[model samples]
Target: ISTLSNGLIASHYGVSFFTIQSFVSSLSNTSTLKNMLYVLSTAVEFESVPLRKGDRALLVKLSKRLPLRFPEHTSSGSVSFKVFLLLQAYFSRLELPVDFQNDLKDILEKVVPLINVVVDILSANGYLNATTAMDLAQMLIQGVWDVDNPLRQIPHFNNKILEKCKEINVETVYDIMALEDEERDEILTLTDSQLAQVAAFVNNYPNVELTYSLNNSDSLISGVKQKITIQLTRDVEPENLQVTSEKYPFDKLESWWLVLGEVSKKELYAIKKVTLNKETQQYELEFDTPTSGKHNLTIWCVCDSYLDADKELSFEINVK
Candidate 1:
């Protein structure tokens, strides 16, 4: 509903600035929507308005925003615009749920460029920093969660079927998962492959580990600047991390905030916007040391994009 300012990416590419939110909503506004859609079709497919000579350089700046790195400018003069042409036939047969048909089309037209542009603005602001569940899983050919709405991240589940499980208090995914064959049938029906699909999607949920250490843990010097190094590690194999949401037009990004402060004292020291692209990467944040003595401090790490992947850990700083 709101406007995303960095929409300049599409504008520069000679397409519409109306972004994902613009196209996704019930857009009865025939003029601009169709205007942009027609422009995108020509620009990406027909190349009637072929990319300009200088824009090859923009891809170099654009590649840094994403987790996966492709060429600055590949065989095509600009691979960014070439995406629609490249993925045309494959998208035709992905068994993409009906809901995703227009969504993917919009992604090719507006979302990809939006991703680069918005990341451009925020990434500039503080150097600055800064989707949801279900969508990402379904896009991975796991299961459709919006239709799986709210729950049923576990496959073969509908609200009505889930209601049957509630009669015996078999309420949660965990509650049903823990049941044995005999106990499981109390409120259920699913084929072997169906059940396996549910488990595959459920267990494949994203897993990330947060580890941190204070550089001055063993030393003590009041008023000195302290460095806190935090490491972000995700559970994945060497060739993985290719997943995204149907509704969202961009890649899966893990954005984090590492806030350090003393709650009891009503004081806050530091806040760092940590974005991770690699399986293993670390960041160092500097903060002024608080007045002397044993400081009972806590660090809160929250993933802004995904739920349930958060951590709150404590550490002590004994100062002079």
Candidate 2:
């Protein structure tokens, strides 16, 4: 068995300086394969790491190599799973090119197989077991449409049109582009700007985080109202914004509202007032605690700056 040695692999594969430096800024020695895998998994989970083109290519190579080299470790499946995480992180960085037609084939071929391998391995290992097919369906749509439809514009499309497009049995870009021009045009026609939008949307998946805190304590007094605050932090700025004719008349949000829920059955509280400071990304919310015991508050914030999806954040509150 090829022993798992980072120094040996780095030297053998000519891994870049930035890659090695970023991974080990906190330590003097090279990391073991297991430790490195763990670190990569955590980095992926937290969205703390973004891979450049070279890093993405290097990781793809490692994904195949590590499994072959470490054939004996059954836990190597986890290592392979992290490789998929790195690739997904890379895909999440997509942006429009002035010329996608020239490079679409190359990019599609490179990513399609990686997507399949990850889905197959993760599903076979019981990670995405029951949802494998559904996951693949969603990713296939993401793979094809993410390059063209800016997520902000998604809500503008008629539900019928969106559903119809999602049902189109095409898998790869090659398959779509190979269709009769009329048939292709009948499906969805994309412009350079729209393509840019899609790229921006994918690049900013789950883009915002709400850092909330209770003003006084984790515990709330029964039948008494209290003030709470949350901070809105953005990972990436919205790109390729609609420049002409802002006819959408949409409300641009700085800080949004949240609601309280009972831990079990009885109602806990009601929101009294909510206000925001866009400049500071700070939100102040007042709640009326009429019948508080143990409760949880939930907030749904837009993942992207536009009409994409919302991510849910929760806070646990105890009543005294």
Candidate 3:
């Protein structure tokens, strides 16, 4: 009649009540806590396996609007096992190839940070048993079993956490918390760099910003736009300068090169606008981007092709 190790619950009301009460009492008993934790884990694992299609949608939704409480007996405490199970479910859905072994490391990097948030919250709340918390933390830190799975690349549609959060006027969990007027204003009016980091972290994604510096000396200027701009400290002179963007869809690059004829006070030109036409049954082909996702944008210069020309500058931008 014990709940922790009994194969299943009885349909009779008295037996079920006794079983439930026993488990509740065991939560406070140090001797029975470890076994109870294992039993709880087993139930969650049973529900998690054979990943449900709905879990992904739920994860994206809850990750943004958290502090969601579950019915008693569903979760232990401050930590939401539902959230963690949702993540594990995502990994299961993404079936990786046999050769995907190498990508497992990167998967771990993305997952552990998220799991730590739950572990920390539980420990602070004094509800997480040491054995369960330690094992769960270790498993998540070990990374996802599948990373390079083709399913990872395949486009799937759902509520984008960042965009959805933005629309609702509560763009991040940070928004839900209290802050002093000045502190809130600071977050509301963060500079471009700080905001960029916030956006990336919320999505559990990473990227580098594209940047440019005018001259080797101080007082250089750069701007963000298709046309990269630069200004020198003293306008000494610019000669034999050229600008180029990375050859995207390298297989389709044609007339991709752009060369400037002379030196001037400033420069402006289309570094990369190579129109791509999909190959057709005939030679006169039509052009279109091979795929829509993220593409790199690089702008580099060759000032007379010196021994040490300016290092190539690049940044990543989402391409539709």
Candidate 4:
């Protein structure tokens, strides 16, 4: 019975998916077999040390060797393998510095900020397991740090170790996102010549943290005997809009004298006109009703006239 220093044996039942038994026996070169076994064992025992920076560096290097392309179908074999490689690369970076492994630890730290955003995006996209993936990622990075620390402290030991150990920490994915948000918002706020740069930023970070609400004109009236005025609390800015609408419900038409402007009046004849606001990348559809009662209204947004589908935002009626 051959014994591995780490308790993993090549002679044991070796054909399982993650087992290194078959891998060890398949290699004809002794040097290659030893190297492969070392890597495999390190992977298996990585969780014990947690911050293995050396392992993280190796994983990042290995990711470069893989084809990063992914297919549209998540379940496809090729796609699965590619995802596996990506995770492998990322996971390897999570390992931390065990001892005085400054090189590996530094590398891993640099990459840490990038992990959160990438993980969130991947999990959201259905490509990864959300619960355990981040934990596993940290463990991989930990191992690299553990191995590289001892190597660095040894005096007159190995020049090769110094050559091999580079900083393992990289910025996490969230860091990338945060930095991007800062840069984008700054450029967007710029004036004059800087506005073009803002446009470029807008093209990329189109999503913003804007809150939305709905309103109806009839809601604010104190007495039902006479007509009262009501308005939408949330008004869409013309420049930022593509298309807009205020659909009137037929149920409230008999109660009050409800009239609308030519551009956007909630009338029996739905009169909606589209005008472009070049300043804000939006389209305006004005809605006006001089008098109000119980009015049914629905708001809609259009992306484009030709290919865009109408997206309904809200529907409500004023009670006054």
Candidate 5:
């Protein structure tokens, strides 16, 4: 797959494949990788046209049963295909409205729960990660994914501003935030309202450190109960900026889920719902030992509402 991707980039850059590969190999930086993929994403979407007619057939196929008919197959990458294409069809002037637009709640009825359902299935099965989470956000918020231009999350920015951003070599959200007051204005060139929304979204964006511990991993007995505690430390107070993206179009409060399960077997041990409204929070999960052996399990902190704001860790549980 990477080989094919390398060729794709090489073709786009009008350079030899090896040159592109080696540049990536030499840098091997996360920012570089995200930039490359999103740049590719920009180009990829450009080639496709939005459906003129609301293809109800596509929607029916894309939207499986409510909770998703097959959580098992949701991890197979086909699920994203279903989700993204469904979104693509919906955004195409969205021909006919199956949903009623009575008010705010009714307005959001369709997009909101479908997303929750998809994320619920994916995370419970251990397939929901940051990249996929953020993709969902981009789809719902902006109806586009120009992750290469993290600046796009800001409202009312036209193409001219975006082109100026690239000319300045500013790529990601951090790049925009890293500059000082004078320099940031010098580059971004946004009006007062736009700046506040950008600031709000940036501050509201979920950036947290996750840590966990098992009560006793080395010494345990079969059928005995043990506990694992998980804690979250945030970069900013959720009290101030509780939710992100002014374009998101809802009065949403952030929520989280602590999921413990085996990714291989797709069996869930415990799941907990949480509301994070502070800088720090904690959660604990207790489960009896399975027979008597070392068990590898995944612990995940999945945000029920936002994307690009999730964490996962694999731990070992042993029973005598």
Candidate 6:
């Protein structure tokens, strides 16, 4: 029959009758009103009482008024209702100790910022629906809740490290600092000159170069050993670096190979000879050559201290 069951609900609060009529008529099914009341009662511990046939308007009135009485629903906008339900469900599941009641306001003060940040981020990322935000916010707060004072360390990024991350195009400080212990130790051992060289090399140039015996010439003789020198033109000194290489030459080839067989597989290049010439200000890499054909050499030059300090260089040589 007609949707109206009870009379106007908010007449005492000056809510007009037509507003209630529109609210009542908006319901497509009788169960819509029933379900709304069920949600309200369960969410706020109200008795599951039946609404009169015309009481749909009364339900809307009650929904508006309960928020004022409960206070939990005071948060404005669409998020407020979801927040109330979530907090109610959360507290219902826990036997919250009364001892922390005094500190609850302070806890809320700290937690509110995280909530605002998370909501803003999620909103920006297109995941900001009411339920999703509430669920995610609860999960995040729980992490701080369950840990040994993890809240105290909440997102305190070092300004210097953050600036470095921006310089290196890193996403986070954690990504910058989460290096292996061996690699981290190596970086710590770098001298100021070497560190600056690595930094400058990283910022300005490719840091290292890979070329064969003759300048820009790829052709060589078979069975004749050639110099596959990888000179560190801008970066760290050879003695201060830990260089690694793979057997596959810069560009893989069929006939030509690195003369020094020591330049083994991936990351296996063992640099035994590092001759520094102050006259030329260069480092020399001596290699043996293979029989007639084209081959390549791949080497990685690394400075112990800087992240991504390793620069890989490849050289192509032809055995003619």
Predicted model with the maximum lDDT: 5
lDDT minimum window of 10 residues, candidate 1? 126-135
Worst 10 residues of 3 by lDDT: 245-254
Clashing residue pair totals per candidate (backbone < 3 A): 1, 2, 5, 52, 0, 20
Q: Please, what is the TM-score per model? A: 0.43, 0.33, 0.17, 0.18, 0.57, 0.26
TM-score, prediction 2: 0.33
Off by over 4 Å in 6: 1-218, 235-280
Candidate 5 segments exceeding 4 Å error: 1-86, 89-107, 114-151, 156-172, 222-225, 240-242
Order the numbered candidates by TM-score, best leading: 5, 1, 2, 6, 4, 3
For model 4, residues 24-69, the per-residue Cα lDDT tens digits are 3432212221232222332321233334335444444555644342
By TM-score, the best candidate is: 5
Instruction: Give candidate 1's root-mean-square deviation (CA, Å).
Output: 13.8
Give the poorly placed runs of model 1, Cα more than 4 Å off. 1-157, 160-200, 242-251, 265-268, 273-280
- Comparing 2 and 4 on lDDT, the stronger one: 2
Give me the runs in candidate 2 sitting further than 4 Å from their true place: 1-206, 216-219, 236-280, 290-292, 302-308
Show the colliding residue pairs in model 3. Answer: 108-143, 276-287, 276-288, 277-286, 277-287
Model 3 over residues 110-228: C-alpha lDDT tens digits? 33333232222222222323223334432232222223221111112123433333454653233523345665444345566754544433232111122343222222223322222
C-alpha lDDT of residue 76 in model 3:
35
Q: After superposition, how far is residue 191 of candidate 3 from its true place, in Å?
A: 47
